Amino acid sequence: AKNVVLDHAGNLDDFVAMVLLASNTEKVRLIGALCTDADCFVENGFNVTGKIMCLMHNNMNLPLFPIGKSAATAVNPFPKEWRCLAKNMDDMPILNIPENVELWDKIKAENEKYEGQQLLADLVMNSEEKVTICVTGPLSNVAWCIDKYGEKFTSKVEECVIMGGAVDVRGNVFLPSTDGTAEWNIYWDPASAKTVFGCPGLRRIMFSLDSTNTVPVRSPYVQRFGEQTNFLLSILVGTMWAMYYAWDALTAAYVVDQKVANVDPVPIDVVVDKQPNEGATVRTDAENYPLTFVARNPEAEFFLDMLLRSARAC
Amino acid sequence: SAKNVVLDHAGNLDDFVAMVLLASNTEKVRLIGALCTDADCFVENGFNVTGKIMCLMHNNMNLPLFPIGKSAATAVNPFPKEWRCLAKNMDDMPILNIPENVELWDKIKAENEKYEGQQLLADLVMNSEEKVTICVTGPLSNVAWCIDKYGEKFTSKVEECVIMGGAVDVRGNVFLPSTDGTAEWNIYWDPASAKTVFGCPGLRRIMFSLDSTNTVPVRSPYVQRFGEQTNFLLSILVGTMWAMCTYYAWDALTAAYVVDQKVANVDPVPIDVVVDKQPNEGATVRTDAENYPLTFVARNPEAEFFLDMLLRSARAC
Ligand SMILES: O=c1[nH]cnc2c1ncn2[C@@H]1O[C@H](CO)[C@@H](O)[C@H]1O
Ligand SMILES: O=c1[nH]cnc2c1ncn2[C@@H]1O[C@H](CO)[C@@H](O)[C@H]1O
Ligand SMILES: O=c1[nH]cnc2c1ncn2[C@@H]1O[C@H](CO)[C@@H](O)[C@H]1O
Ligand SMILES: O=c1[nH]cnc2c1ncn2[C@@H]1O[C@H](CO)[C@@H](O)[C@H]1O
Ligand SMILES: [Ca+2]
Ligand SMILES: [Ca+2]
Ligand code: NI
C-alpha cells in the first residue's frame, strides 16, 4: 500500500473521503490526518476524525494514526450555514459507542499536542517512501509546508490529489460580493491555493467541479446503505450522505484507484485579488507555467460501487 | 388498558421522535393512525418517513399497522423555510431503509396514498368504538377542518387533544420583519384554524406551549447516551434525529404526556388566537370573554422523567 495523509475541512464529504481511504488498507496506508477549522469548527472536526478512526480501529485492521488540528485561519470563511455539520456528526449514535469513545478519550491527549501544519510537513518529510496527500479542504496547509520547506517537502510528495476549483464550469461561491466563478475550497484561502497550483516540482491531480458535477448524491443510491446495516461503516456513510455532490469522496476514490478518472494537464493559476472572481482557478498561458492534471469524465459507477463495497469493511 | 391515539404531525425531526414515543409505549398507547401536513416538511417525505418507521416497528416490536394520510391543508403563513428538508434527509437514512421494512412499506403504500388526511382523521375518530386522543404536533388545520365539517359528531368522540403550540407567558419564536416575536410557529402557520380549535366548547385540550417546552432543551451529552444503546434500532433512529438538531424537545414532550400524564401538571387558561394581520398574528392570548372554553396549559414539566422515558422507549427494539 502507499502512504497517504488526509488534509480535510470537516464537512460530511470530508468524512466519507476519510472512510474510503481508511477502509482500503490493501491500497492505502493512512498515516495521518489534519483538520482545518474551515467547513467546520476545528474542535468538532477533530473529534469526529478521532471517533471515526477509533470506531474503525476497534473493528477492522486499521492502525491508529496521528490527527492534528491545523492553525490555518480563513481569508474568506465558509457559510456558517454548513460549518457546524461536524457538530452534528459528533453526536450521532454510531460514533458514540462506549468502547470506541473510551479509546478516543485515551489517545486524545497525544493528538491534541500536534499542530496540524507541522504534522503534515513531518509525516511527508520523515516517511521512508513518498507520500500522497489527499486534500479535501482548503490548500492552506500544503501552502504552509511549501513556504516553510520548499523542495525538502515537495520532493517527498508522490502527488497531491486536490478537491477544489472549477476550470471549464461555473463555480459554487454565490455571495452578494462574488460572480459565481470560484469554488469554496479555493475561495477560503486564494493565496495559499496560488502557491500550491504554481509550485513547480509538485505533481497535482485536481478534482474540480468539472468532474465532481457529474457524480451527484442521489436518493436510490444512498438508500442502498440500508441494505448493509450490519456494517458500521454503512450506517456511518449512509447517515452522512442522507444529509449535494460527492466532491471529496470522488477525490479520495482516485487515491484508492486511479481508474476513477483520466486526467489532462492544464496550467492553473488563481485570482487572489479582492474582486468578484476572487478565488477563481483560471487557465494561464504564461510560458513554462506548471501543469496540473485535471480529472475528466470520472467513472461514476466504478466510484459508487467502490464506496458501497468499502462501507462493508466493518 | 391502552387508549386509542392518532398522531397529527408536520414531519420535522421532533414530530418523528414524538411518533416513536407514542408507538413504542404499547402498554399505554394504541396508535390507530397518523396524518402528515405539508408544513415543516414536504409532505411526501413526511408520509414516507412515517410509513418507514411504522414498518420497522411492526417487524421488530409487533406494532400493529395503521392508516397514514397526507393532509390537503395549505398554509396561511408558510415558513420562509430552509428547514422543511429534515424529512427528506430522514427518508434516506440507512436504518429506515432496511429491505424487509421497505418491502412491507412498498406493499401497503398505495392503500395509504389514497387517504386524504383530513377526512382520515375525521373517520378514525368518528368510527372508533372508544374515544380517541389526538396528539397534534404540527398546525391545527386538520382538527379545525374536522370541527368545521362535523361539529359535535366529531368532538364528542375525542377524549382530548394534546397540542404542541403557542406561547402564553413567554416570548414566541416567529421572528420576521413584520412580527413582534410573540407568536409560535405551529399557530402562526394557520391562525384561523388554531382559533377554531381553542374556542371549541366541549373539546378537552391540553397545550404544550413554549412556556413548558423551553424547560427541556436537546443537549449533546444526553443525545450521545443513545450511543450506549446501538443494539436497538430505535436508539440509532432517535439519536440520529436529535443529533442533527441538537432546538427543543417540543413535540416529544407533548407525546410523552399522552404516554404518562405525570410528565406535567396543567393549568386552565381561556385561549384565543390573534388572526388579524398584526405584528402578533398567531399569538395565543388569554381572553377575558365570559364563559370562554378552557385549555389546560402544561406547566413545569418533569424533565428528568421525560429524558429517562425517551431513553427507555428507545430500547423497545
Ligand atoms: O453546500 C455545501 N454543503 C456542504 N459542504 C459544501 C457545500 N458547498 C461546498 N462544500 C465543501 O466545499 C467543497 C466543494 O466546493 C468540498 O470539499 C465540500 O466539503
Ligand atoms: O405511490 C407511490 N408509489 C411508488 N413510488 C412512489 C409513490 N409516491 C411517490 N413515489 C416515489 O417515486 C419513486 C418510486 O417510483 C420513489 O422516489 C418514491 O419515493
Ligand atoms: O424576539 C425577537 N427576536 C429576534 N428577532 C425578532 C424578535 N421579534 C421580532 N423580531 C424581528 O424579526 C427579524 C429578525 O428575525 C427582525 O426584523 C426583527 O424586527
Ligand atoms: O428552528 C426550528 N427548526 C426545526 N423545527 C422547528 C424550529 N422552530 C420551530 N420548529 C417546529 O415548530 C414547533 C415549535 O415551534 C414544533 O412542532 C417544531 O416541530
Ligand atoms: Ca471538504
Ligand atoms: Ca412539529
Ligand atoms: Ni406518493
Coordinates of all heavy atoms in Angstrom, one line a residue, chain B residues 10-54, unseen atoms left out:
Chain B
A10 N -46.3 17.3 11.5 CA -45.8 18.1 10.4 C -44.4 17.6 9.8 O -43.7 18.4 9.1 CB -45.7 19.6 10.8
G11 N -44.0 16.4 10.2 CA -42.8 15.9 9.6 C -41.4 16.4 9.9 O -40.6 16.2 9.0
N12 N -41.3 17.1 11.0 CA -39.9 17.5 11.3 C -39.3 16.5 12.2 O -40.0 15.6 12.6 CB -39.9 18.9 11.9 CG -38.6 19.7 11.5 OD1 -38.7 20.6 10.6 ND2 -37.5 19.4 12.1
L13 N -38.0 16.7 12.6 CA -37.4 15.7 13.4 C -38.1 15.4 14.7 O -38.3 14.3 15.1 CB -35.9 16.1 13.7 CG -35.1 16.3 12.4 CD1 -33.7 16.9 12.7 CD2 -34.9 14.9 11.7
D14 N -38.6 16.5 15.4 CA -39.3 16.2 16.6 C -40.6 15.5 16.5 O -41.1 14.8 17.4 CB -39.4 17.3 17.6 CG -39.2 16.9 19.1 OD1 -38.2 16.2 19.4 OD2 -40.1 17.3 19.9
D15 N -41.3 15.7 15.4 CA -42.6 15.1 15.1 C -42.3 13.6 15.1 O -43.1 12.8 15.6 CB -43.2 15.5 13.7 CG -43.5 16.9 13.7 OD1 -44.7 17.3 14.0 OD2 -42.7 17.8 13.3
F16 N -41.1 13.2 14.5 CA -40.8 11.8 14.4 C -40.3 11.2 15.8 O -40.6 10.0 16.0 CB -39.8 11.5 13.3 CG -40.4 11.7 11.9 CD1 -39.8 12.6 11.0 CD2 -41.6 11.1 11.6 CE1 -40.5 12.9 9.8 CE2 -42.2 11.4 10.4 CZ -41.7 12.3 9.5
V17 N -39.7 12.0 16.6 CA -39.3 11.5 17.9 C -40.7 11.2 18.7 O -40.8 10.3 19.4 CB -38.4 12.4 18.7 CG1 -38.2 11.9 20.1 CG2 -37.1 12.6 18.0
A18 N -41.6 12.2 18.5 CA -43.0 12.0 19.2 C -43.6 10.7 18.7 O -44.2 9.9 19.5 CB -43.9 13.2 18.8
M19 N -43.5 10.5 17.4 CA -44.1 9.2 16.8 C -43.5 8.0 17.5 O -44.2 7.1 17.9 CB -43.8 9.1 15.3 CG -44.5 7.9 14.7 SD -44.1 7.8 13.0 CE -44.9 6.0 12.7
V20 N -42.2 8.0 17.7 CA -41.5 6.8 18.3 C -42.0 6.7 19.7 O -42.2 5.6 20.2 CB -40.0 7.0 18.2 CG1 -39.3 5.8 19.0 CG2 -39.5 6.9 16.8
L21 N -42.1 7.8 20.4 CA -42.6 7.7 21.8 C -44.0 7.1 21.9 O -44.2 6.2 22.7 CB -42.6 9.1 22.5 CG -41.4 9.5 23.2 CD1 -41.6 11.0 23.6 CD2 -41.2 8.6 24.5
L22 N -44.9 7.6 21.1 CA -46.2 7.0 21.1 C -46.3 5.6 20.7 O -46.8 4.7 21.4 CB -47.1 7.8 20.1 CG -47.3 9.3 20.5 CD1 -48.0 10.0 19.4 CD2 -48.2 9.4 21.8
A23 N -45.6 5.2 19.6 CA -45.6 3.9 19.1 C -44.9 2.9 20.0 O -45.3 1.7 20.2 CB -45.0 3.8 17.7
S24 N -43.8 3.3 20.7 CA -43.1 2.3 21.5 C -43.7 2.0 22.8 O -43.4 1.0 23.4 CB -41.7 2.8 21.7 OG -41.7 4.0 22.4
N25 N -44.7 2.8 23.3 CA -45.3 2.6 24.6 C -46.6 1.9 24.4 O -47.7 2.4 24.8 CB -45.4 3.9 25.3 CG -44.1 4.3 26.0 OD1 -43.7 3.9 27.1 ND2 -43.3 5.2 25.3
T26 N -46.6 0.7 24.0 CA -47.9 0.0 23.7 C -48.7 -0.4 24.9 O -49.9 -0.6 24.8 CB -47.6 -1.3 23.0 OG1 -46.5 -2.0 23.6 CG2 -47.2 -1.0 21.5
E27 N -48.2 -0.4 26.1 CA -49.0 -0.6 27.3 C -49.9 0.5 27.5 O -51.1 0.4 28.0 CB -48.1 -0.7 28.6 CG -48.9 -1.2 29.8
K28 N -49.5 1.7 27.1 CA -50.3 3.0 27.3 C -51.0 3.5 26.1 O -52.1 4.2 26.2 CB -49.3 4.0 27.8 CG -49.3 4.4 29.2 CD -49.3 3.2 30.1 CE -49.2 3.6 31.6 NZ -48.2 4.7 31.7
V29 N -50.5 3.3 24.9 CA -51.0 3.8 23.7 C -51.2 2.8 22.5 O -50.3 2.0 22.2 CB -49.9 4.9 23.2 CG1 -50.3 5.5 21.7 CG2 -49.9 6.1 24.2
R30 N -52.4 2.9 21.9 CA -52.7 2.1 20.8 C -52.8 3.1 19.6 O -53.7 3.9 19.5 CB -54.1 1.4 20.9 CG -54.5 0.5 19.8 CD -56.0 0.0 20.0 NE -56.1 -0.7 21.2 CZ -56.7 -0.2 22.3 NH1 -57.4 0.9 22.3 NH2 -56.7 -1.0 23.4
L31 N -51.7 3.2 18.8 CA -51.7 4.1 17.7 C -52.5 3.6 16.6 O -52.2 2.7 15.9 CB -50.2 4.3 17.3 CG -49.8 5.4 16.3 CD1 -50.3 6.8 16.8 CD2 -48.3 5.4 16.2
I32 N -53.6 4.3 16.3 CA -54.6 3.8 15.3 C -54.5 4.6 14.0 O -55.3 4.3 13.0 CB -56.0 3.8 15.8 CG1 -56.5 5.2 16.1 CG2 -56.1 3.0 17.1 CD1 -58.0 5.3 16.3
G33 N -53.6 5.6 13.9 CA -53.5 6.3 12.6 C -52.6 7.5 12.8 O -52.2 7.9 13.9
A34 N -52.2 8.0 11.6 CA -51.3 9.2 11.6 C -51.6 10.0 10.4 O -52.1 9.5 9.3 CB -49.8 8.9 11.6
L35 N -51.5 11.4 10.5 CA -51.6 12.2 9.3 C -50.4 13.1 9.3 O -49.9 13.4 10.3 CB -53.0 12.9 9.2 CG -53.4 13.8 10.3 CD1 -54.4 14.9 9.8 CD2 -54.1 12.9 11.4
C36 N -50.0 13.5 8.1 CA -48.9 14.4 7.8 C -49.3 15.6 7.1 O -50.1 15.5 6.1 CB -47.8 13.7 7.0 SG -47.5 11.9 7.4
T37 N -48.9 16.8 7.5 CA -49.2 18.1 6.9 C -48.0 18.7 6.3 O -46.9 18.5 6.8 CB -49.8 19.0 8.0 OG1 -51.0 18.4 8.4 CG2 -50.0 20.4 7.4
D38 N -48.2 19.4 5.1 CA -47.1 20.0 4.3 C -46.7 21.3 4.9 O -46.9 22.4 4.3 CB -47.7 20.1 2.9 CG -46.6 20.4 1.8 OD1 -45.5 19.8 1.9 OD2 -46.9 21.2 0.9
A39 N -46.3 21.3 6.2 CA -45.9 22.5 7.0 C -44.4 22.5 7.2 O -43.7 23.3 6.5 CB -46.6 22.4 8.3
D40 N -43.8 21.7 8.1 CA -42.4 21.7 8.5 C -41.6 20.6 7.7 O -40.5 20.1 8.2 CB -42.3 21.4 10.0 CG -41.3 22.3 10.7 OD1 -40.5 22.9 10.0 OD2 -41.3 22.2 11.9
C41 N -42.1 20.2 6.5 CA -41.5 19.2 5.7 C -42.3 19.2 4.4 O -43.4 19.8 4.4 CB -41.8 17.8 6.3 SG -43.7 17.2 6.1
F42 N -41.8 18.6 3.4 CA -42.5 18.4 2.1 C -43.3 17.1 2.5 O -42.7 16.1 2.9 CB -41.6 18.1 1.0 CG -42.3 17.4 -0.2 CD1 -43.6 17.8 -0.6 CD2 -41.6 16.5 -1.0 CE1 -44.2 17.3 -1.7 CE2 -42.2 16.0 -2.2 CZ -43.5 16.3 -2.5
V43 N -44.6 17.2 2.4 CA -45.5 16.1 2.9 C -45.2 14.7 2.3 O -45.4 13.7 3.1 CB -47.0 16.5 2.7 CG1 -47.4 16.4 1.3 CG2 -47.8 15.6 3.7
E44 N -44.7 14.6 1.1 CA -44.4 13.3 0.6 C -43.3 12.6 1.4 O -43.4 11.4 1.7 CB -44.0 13.3 -0.9 CG -43.9 12.0 -1.6 CD -45.2 11.2 -1.8 OE1 -46.3 11.9 -1.6 OE2 -45.2 10.0 -2.2
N45 N -42.3 13.4 1.8 CA -41.2 12.9 2.6 C -41.7 12.5 4.0 O -41.4 11.5 4.5 CB -40.1 13.9 2.7 CG -39.5 14.3 1.4 OD1 -39.3 13.4 0.5 ND2 -39.1 15.5 1.3
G46 N -42.5 13.4 4.6 CA -43.1 13.1 5.9 C -43.9 11.8 5.9 O -43.9 11.0 6.8
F47 N -44.7 11.7 4.8 CA -45.5 10.5 4.6 C -44.6 9.2 4.6 O -44.9 8.2 5.3 CB -46.3 10.7 3.3 CG -47.1 9.5 2.8 CD1 -48.3 9.1 3.4 CD2 -46.7 8.7 1.7 CE1 -49.0 8.0 3.0 CE2 -47.4 7.7 1.2 CZ -48.6 7.3 1.9
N48 N -43.6 9.2 3.7 CA -42.7 8.1 3.6 C -41.9 7.8 4.9 O -41.8 6.6 5.2 CB -41.7 8.3 2.5 CG -42.4 8.0 1.1 OD1 -43.2 7.1 1.0 ND2 -42.0 8.8 0.1
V49 N -41.5 8.8 5.6 CA -40.7 8.5 6.9 C -41.7 7.9 7.9 O -41.3 7.0 8.6 CB -40.1 9.8 7.4 CG1 -39.5 9.6 8.8 CG2 -39.0 10.3 6.4
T50 N -42.9 8.4 8.0 CA -43.9 7.8 8.9 C -44.1 6.3 8.6 O -44.1 5.5 9.4 CB -45.3 8.5 8.8 OG1 -45.1 9.9 9.0 CG2 -46.3 8.0 9.8
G51 N -44.3 6.1 7.3 CA -44.5 4.7 6.8 C -43.3 3.8 7.1 O -43.5 2.7 7.6
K52 N -42.1 4.3 6.8 CA -40.9 3.5 7.1 C -40.7 3.3 8.6 O -40.2 2.2 9.0 CB -39.7 4.2 6.5 CG -39.7 4.1 5.0 CD -38.5 4.8 4.3 CE -38.5 4.5 2.8 NZ -37.4 5.3 2.2
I53 N -41.0 4.2 9.5 CA -40.9 4.0 10.9 C -41.9 3.0 11.4 O -41.6 2.0 12.1 CB -41.0 5.3 11.7 CG1 -39.8 6.2 11.5 CG2 -41.1 5.0 13.2 CD1 -40.0 7.7 12.1
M54 N -43.1 3.1 10.9 CA -44.2 2.2 11.3 C -43.8 0.7 10.9 O -44.0 -0.2 11.7 CB -45.5 2.6 10.6 CG -46.6 1.5 10.8 SD -48.2 2.1 10.0 CE -47.8 1.7 8.3

